[PDB]
Structures are given as structure tokens and as C-alpha cells.
UniProtKB/Swiss-Prot annotation, chain A:
Source organism of the structure: Mycobacterium tuberculosis (strain ATCC 25618 / H37Rv)
TM regions (residue ranges): none
Organism domain of life: Bacteria
Gene name as annotated: relA
Gene deletion effect: Cells lacking this gene fail to synthesize ppGpp in response to starvation.
Protein name stated in the entry: Bifunctional (p)ppGpp synthase/hydrolase RelA
Length: 321, 323
């Protein structure tokens, strides 16, 4: 339990002063279960935040236990002091910023008990102010999941409608992709380009809004047919566009190169749509492994923040207020 | 002469240099530049030393009292077969074949003898059979040249009109290409792809046929703005298609991938057309340095699809000539 989470940290960076994170958990353990801090500490370690953030395991202690921040800060430091306080100060809104999104992500995933007010409203709150905030942090895996869960609880029969509507044409649609995957992989293996060719992991809240704007009677067969390519270096990402276009005719005005032009900072992705093997618009999304690391899980959110409707914490409060 | 050896030698460190010294020496003793001048343009293609020797003593027998029986004994059977085989190929209205194309290409380059009937006829002959024969093997650099010289002589005022029309909009047209070359090169240097970005070399016989099939009123501004990207390895050729598409929007049809699907023998090359940089289509032609070598100086094609192989192909060739 403790070993795997620390192991998931160590592979990233051979770091010094391991005796703080042992101290962190030990003191927390002594201070239905105590796993939430460590469970969080793992999904933060999976993102790859600082060992101080990992320590800062001790975030829920001051509200639940008798001991206080003045005692806490002395044991570990001033940084842990500011963090645990900063994360505690954040409340429901009609380092510190990333720690919170993890805390909530887990709580959303684990809803064993469904007492009333917390349940429906947490979903509502997450969608309203946590999904976009997560999106500002540039981590797609955090947001995407947070939404789907939230969407299920808020609109159950609408979720049901989608997942049922998804399930109907699944066998025909899944086969169609399996051909494309083969057809695309063959030629790049002849071309000698090292690349992974996964299918796009799909999301129901996306499908919900995508349907809403299009209206009822929208096309189901091709909307759910998305594919991704992954490459080692920028050269190879541009090479993929080569092989794709060789196999199928591209569509005008739907082509992008975010590697060439970054929006909201470094997205580092190429998006193209082509007319398909059965005349289907198929959305391809080429990007590197290093760029994937950024796109889905890890970012610091330095610049190009924009309001709508640490310095980030006062920024965030302004955003909710 | 001395420099002929230098262009040949750096291709392949080879033994028995004495034969090519013997070749020129015995030829010199037997205007004597035509053999060696040919022997150079063959060496530029990169033919076998035996081919270099033969092409050095191929025309001797007709101009010189010495015969093939004496000639073959000095240099063996191979040079016997070559020098004879090429002589047998006469005027019509694989090593042997390549030597002949080099000869006609040289004689076409230098035409101080305008008086002979060949000036127009020899040109007529090359366009009818030698241009397709050169092209069939896979050699374009030879073909490209052969045509422009032949076509210039055959139709003087038509040629004049094409070069004139070309010259008119040249400054406006060359400026686009300078901007396109810059915009392309900036982004591939950011992408960190090693790639040369030359402009396409234009041909007037092509413009003649293109405008004939498309009629008099045709867009001269975008007809030939062609770019030619060049990269080391197959991977990088696909990477070029990337940078091009990043900058401009590609046409649905007119796309090809000859590396993936080589027409007849291997002509591996990526042809793509894109519009909207200037609101006009531009033809991009990506291929490897190796691929480029191959295309420009194709040694030969196994078969055109339209010794004994040489004679019968020659026979179809000669029928095309009669045509
Ligand atoms: Mg908590
Ligand atoms: Mg001769």
C-alpha cells in the first residue's frame, strides 16, 4: 500500500530526503478509513508533483484532529504550512490548486454513501467550477473523468440514453475502426515510423453537448469513430499526417497544427479530419509521448489564463468570486 | 584525360585502372572529344568501367581501318558485344542502350552542323523514339534535356513564345516561390527535419503540351510554381507532407504516394497539391536524395511494358520511330 505509492514517485526522479514522506504518512496514520490522503497522494504522484506536495497526506488533519497548523509547520516546514492551510481555505463556490482537484477527483470516484445534499450538489459543483478549472490546469484525464461521473448523477436517464445509444451500433462501429487501425499501421510499418495507434477514449458529457447543438437525429455511426496516433519525436508526428493522407482524402478548413501554433500555451497537437473508408469523417489526433504527458496529466499553468462569465490562489478566488 | 577518372573513381574504389588508360590511349591514336565527352556523362550516371572503356572505342570501327576482331582481342568479349551492339543501332526517322542515349544527348547539345538534314530530323527522331526510350529506362535528366533542345529547333517561334511568356511574369512569379521557400523552411527547421528546398526546374516542351490540351487562355501565373523538397530517409519524406499541410490546405484529389505504390518499376515519390497560399494551386514533390538520384538518373527499367531483349525492344522502339 505505502510501497507502491512511494514507488510510483521514485521512478520519476531519484530524490533525497525520503525520511520526510515516511514521517508524513506515519504522523498522519497516528493522527471508514484513513486512506483518502494516501489515495490522493498516489494520484498526485501519478501526475508527478513535488515530494513536499505528497507530504502536504497531512492536509485533512487540522479539521478532523485536535492538533493545529502551528504544530504541523514546525515539524515539516513553512511550505507545508502554507499548502495545508491554502488547500483548507478553498471551499465550495457557486500547488494548492492541483492538490484540491485530486482530493475532489477521488471523492467523486468513491461515493459509497449517497446522503442527499452532498451527492447531487457535488456533481453540480464539480461540473460548474472544477471541470473548467481542471481544464485551465491543462490535464484532460482529470477533467474528462470528473465530468462523466458528475453527468451520470445529475442526468441519469440522459446518461442511460447515451450509453444505451452508444451500445447499439457498437459491434458494427468497433469493426470499422479495427480495419482503419490495420490499414493505418501497415503502411507506417513499411515506412519505418515508430508509432502507437490507439483508439480514442470516449466521453458521454461530450456526446451529450455534441448532440444538443446538432439536435435530435444527429449521425451516430461516425461521431463516435475517433482515432489517435502517438510518436517519439515531432518529425514522426508530421510523418503520420503523411501516411494518413496517403490512405484517405482530407477535408478542407478542418485542419490544425497546434505544434506549429500554440493556443492556451503549448497544446502541442495536430488535428486532422479526412473522408473515410465508407465516406465517414474520421477525427485523427497525432501528438508525441512527451506532448501526451502534458496534454492529459501534468502541467503548471504559467500563462494565458483568461477569466470568463501562490498567485494562482488569489486568481482562483477571483474566478469563483 | 585526367578529370574523367575523378568523377568515376569516387563512386566506387575499383581495380584494373590500366584498362581505361589503355582505352583512351588506343582511341586517341586510332576532334576526338566525342568518345570521352560521352564517357564523362556516362560516368556522371555511374556506369561500369567496361562500359566506360567501350564507350571510349565504340565509333572507331566506322572511322578507323581497324576492325572488331582486333578490338575485342585487346579488351575481351564484353567490349566486343557492346561496341558492336551500339553500332547496329542506327537512325530511325541494357549497357549498350545507355551508351547510345548518351551519344545522341551530346550530339543534340552541340549542333554547329546546322546544314545537315539532321538539324530538324535528328531532333524529330529524338522526340519520337529517344525521349521515350530515355524515359522508359527511368532516366529523366537525360529526357528533360533531349526534348527542350529538339523542340526548340523543331518549332522555333513556338519555343520563342513559351520562353517569352515565361519571361513576362517571371519577377512576380519568382517572388511567390521565395516567400513559399522561406515559410516552408522556417517551420521544418523548428520541427528539426533535415531538408533541401529547391525550386523545380522548368521545361518548355511540357508547357507546350500542357497549354495545347488546356487551350490558349490559361493561367500562366500558377502553371509552374513547383517546389521540390528533398530528404535523406523515407520517414522524413512523410514529415515534409506534414509541414506543407500545416501551412496550406490540401486538394482532395490529385494526391499520390508512389513510395507506397510504385508505378511499374520503383519511382518512389510523394506528389501533393495545395491551394490558398496565393489562392492558386502549387505542386509539391517530396522524395529522398536516394530516391531523387534514382528518378533523375534511372539506370534502367526492367521492362517498358510496350542481346535478344535489346533487339526486340529495339524492334518496338524502331516501330515507334516509324510512327
Ligand atoms: Mg477530503
Ligand atoms: Mg559516334
Amino acid at each position: 500500500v505505502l510501497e507502491p505509492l512511494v514507488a510510483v514517485h521514485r521512478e520519476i526522479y531519484p530524490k533525497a530526503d525520503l525520511s520526510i514522506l515516511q514521517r508524513a504518512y506515519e504522523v498522519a496514520d497516528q493522527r471508514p478509513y484513513i486512506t483518502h490522503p494516501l489515495a490522493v497522494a498516489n494520484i498526485l504522484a501519478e501526475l508527478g508533483m513535488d515530494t513536499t506536495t505528497l507530504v502536504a497526506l497531512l492536509h485533512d488533519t487540522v479539521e478532523d484532529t485536535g492538533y493545529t497548523l502551528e504544530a504541523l509547520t514546525e515539524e515539516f516546514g513553512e511550505e507545508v504550512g502554507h499548502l495545508v492551510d491554502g488547500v483548507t481555505k478553498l471551499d465550495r463556490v457557486v500547488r494548492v490548486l492541483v492538490i484540491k482537484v485530486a482530493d475532489r477527483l477521488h471523492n467523486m470516484r468513491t461515493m459509497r454513501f449517497l446522503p442527499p445534499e452532498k451527492q447531487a450538489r457535488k456533481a453540480r459543483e464539480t461540473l460548474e467550477v472544477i471541470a473548467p478549472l481542471a481544464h485551465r490546469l491543462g490535464m484532460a484525464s482529470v477533467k474528462w473523468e470528473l465530468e462523466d461521473l458528475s453527468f451520470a448523477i445529475l442526468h441519469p436517464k440522459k446518461y442511460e440514453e447515451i450509453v444505451r445509444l452508444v451500445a447499439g451500433r457498437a459491434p458494427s462501429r468497433d469493426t470499422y475502426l479495427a480495419k482503419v487501425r490495420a490499414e493505418i499501421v501497415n503502411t507506417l510499418t513499411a515506412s519505418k515510423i515508430k508509432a502507437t495507434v490507439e483508439g480514442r477514449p470516449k466521453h458521454y458529457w461530450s456526446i451529450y453537448q455534441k448532440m444538443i447543438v446538432k439536435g435530435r437525429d444527429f449521425d451516430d455511426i461516425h461521431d463516435l469513430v475517433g482515432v489517435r496516433i502517438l510518436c517519439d519525436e515531432i518529425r514522426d508526428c508530421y510523418a503520420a499526417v503523411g501516411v494518413v493522407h496517403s490512405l484517405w482524402q482530407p477535408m478542407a478548413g478542418r485542419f490544425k497544427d497546434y505544434i506549429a501554433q500554440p493556443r492556451y500555451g503549448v497544446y502541442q497537437s495536430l488535428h486532422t479530419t479526412v473522408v473515410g473508408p465508407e465516406g465517414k469523417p474520421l477525427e485523427v489526433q497525432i501528438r508525441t509521448r512527451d506532448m501526451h504527458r502534458t496534454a492529459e496529466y501534468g502541467i503548471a499553468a504559467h500563462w494565458r489564463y483568461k477569466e470568463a462569465k501562490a498567485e494562482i490562489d488569489d486568481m482562483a478566488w477571483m474566478r469563483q468570486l
